[PDB]
């Protein structure tokens, strides 16, 4: 149980990630995570980015873990685990579209 359900849901795909995101009631900045069904079973970091000029939407950052290091949505910034990178991404965008699930969504 890395976090709980703010930036990570579990073993979800991009169809639900975009759904739950635009169907949960959370505001943009909701960087959800989930296992990628593209490979044997990698990870992912979906993100809700609705806008006041187009409607709601949801992008995604395929998460991958190198056995030579740890995790990384982009090869420019890896970490040791999903909780450790959600830790760095929380105080920093990490280089992607931005940080991860907002801490004070309220």
């Amino acid at each position: 149980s890395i976090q709980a359900e703010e930036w990570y849901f579990g073993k979800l795909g991009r169809k639900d990630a975009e759904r739950q995101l635009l169907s949960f009631g959370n505001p943009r900045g909701t960087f959800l995570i989930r296992e990628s069904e593209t490979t044997k079973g990698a990870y992912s970091l979906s993100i809700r980015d609705w806008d006041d000029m187009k409607g709601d939407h949801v992008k995604h950052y395929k998460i991958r873990k190198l056995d030579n290091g740890g995790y990384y949505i982009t090869t420019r910034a890896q970490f040791e685990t999903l909780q450790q990178l959600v830790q760095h991404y929380s105080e920093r965008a990490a280089g992607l579209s931005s940080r991860l699930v907002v801490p004070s969504h309220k």
Partner: peptide, 11 residues
């Protein structure tokens, strides 16, 4: 870009 977005893209 195709596939998941990637921070890097230039050469």
């Amino acid at each position: 870009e195709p596939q998941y977005e990637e921070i890097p893209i230039y050469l």
